[PDB]
Amino acid sequence: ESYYSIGEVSKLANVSIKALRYYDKIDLFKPAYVDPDTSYRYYTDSQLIHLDLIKSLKYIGTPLEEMKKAQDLEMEELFAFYTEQERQIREKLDFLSALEQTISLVKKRMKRQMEYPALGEVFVLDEEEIRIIQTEAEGIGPENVLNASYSKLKKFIESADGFTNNSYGATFSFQPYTSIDEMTYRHIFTPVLTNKQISSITPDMEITTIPKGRYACIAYNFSPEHYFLNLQKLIKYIADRQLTVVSDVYELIIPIHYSPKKQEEYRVEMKIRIA
Amino acid sequence: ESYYSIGEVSKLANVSIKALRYYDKIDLFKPAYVDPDTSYRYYTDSQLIHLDLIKSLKYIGTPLEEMKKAQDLEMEELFAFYTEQERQIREKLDFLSALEQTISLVKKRMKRQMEYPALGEVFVLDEEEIRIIQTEAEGIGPENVLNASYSKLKKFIESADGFTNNSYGATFSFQPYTSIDEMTYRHIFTPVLTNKQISSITPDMEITTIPKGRYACIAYNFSPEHYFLNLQKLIKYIADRQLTVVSDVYELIIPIHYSPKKQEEYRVEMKIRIA
DNA sequence: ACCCTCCCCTTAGGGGAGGGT
């Protein structure tokens, strides 16, 4: 013969009144009784127990309506349910955990960029390999190149990485170019970070890599008048130290801000490998 | 000199029109321009890139408004941001992962119950230990005992386990009782599952355990007329096989359904340990 | 002091409809 004022309840079970009042209307936890004069809600000591499964359920993060159907069931039943909630919990787990590493990649990459000590001049080094899938730019030249021109490769990388292209790129041959118009892009790629089996690749793509080798590269921020010279310094550089090239030029631009509020920029980075 | 119909966009970047239209009003991704006749939205090929950070951001699961402030920043800045997003991701991780094991406990327990082969009769066995905190029931008897009578211990276990009391319990001495009224509860406890340092325990509690020992226990579903006899069979059992008891009786009830829709039941389980 | 109720806020869009080229 003991009843509890709603407050009392909110006190006993740790509950937001608004919360239980909500449950009453939600029609989950209803008062044992309602004084139809004061519309006050008064619960029964027995009731409390109900507030467990909801409470527990809530903790596990199960949407209320499911909680409804959940209450009716008996042990061995609810048990299975619990297991469901388990594969579940255990799934966001590995989903989430995945990105955890993915990010790391993005950062280890992000950083790597800002660390370019010789912003402006040619730098030589030992680089690590770069899994990347690319296609064959059908006549795309440094002039024409778009974004649209990327899309496919884009869609793909998102499907597999979840994370989109950060730094866009393209290869072109190696020549003692006279002018820009002189040059025209070969393949255009995108770096790939999700180690998992990249599947469903329509054969128009090639999944490949930028072999961990000797690199002659240089970086900056784009400027037409710029871009040029830098390729120049580049060509010259090699020519001078008479080294032997081994690939095409990996030009690889990355936007620097993403603000729309203002005139975009991108750190560019052309590179060749050598022996 | 290339523009894209909103659709085109939705096609190029993988986007729900409603989604970008939302971004336009959200005032994140705005059309490059709006034909003030047809109010159509037309974006610039350049724009696309913006759709990266949002897209990426979205993936990581960062609320739009934060995405707003996120766009303005530059590399080394956004980088930190990224790291934030990291501790973050890496936090739901271990939070979540925690329960993952917690559940397992609950289940390994849940199951354990349904497996009681001798529902009705006394069973003897080798049990594992039970970390549990309890208090000293101030005169609570099998008659009086509430829920309210629990609250404190309750609040506590939730703070530490997140998960609430599933199976409620209490100890009482061991005697050749005549009647129920004859008996009166000693401590009442609650089992504890979160292995972590149970802190802030107000000294009115005792954190303890149900020593992995020999047990004489029996189970059922509550029924007043029942409860009694079963304690009886119990007492008798020992007495008969003249064993030597070593603790008090661990009576430990658990509700069987949680349906409010109907008259509650609970599997009870009284037990003593012995040598 | 407690309670009750009504209302208006929070996110990220989706569906659906009418209407217009």
Added chain:
DNA sequence: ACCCTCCCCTTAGGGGAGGGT
């Protein structure tokens, strides 16, 4: 065919106010 807009749905409550014992 595409687009545009308006509207009304989704969750779990919170705050806040007025009013009543």
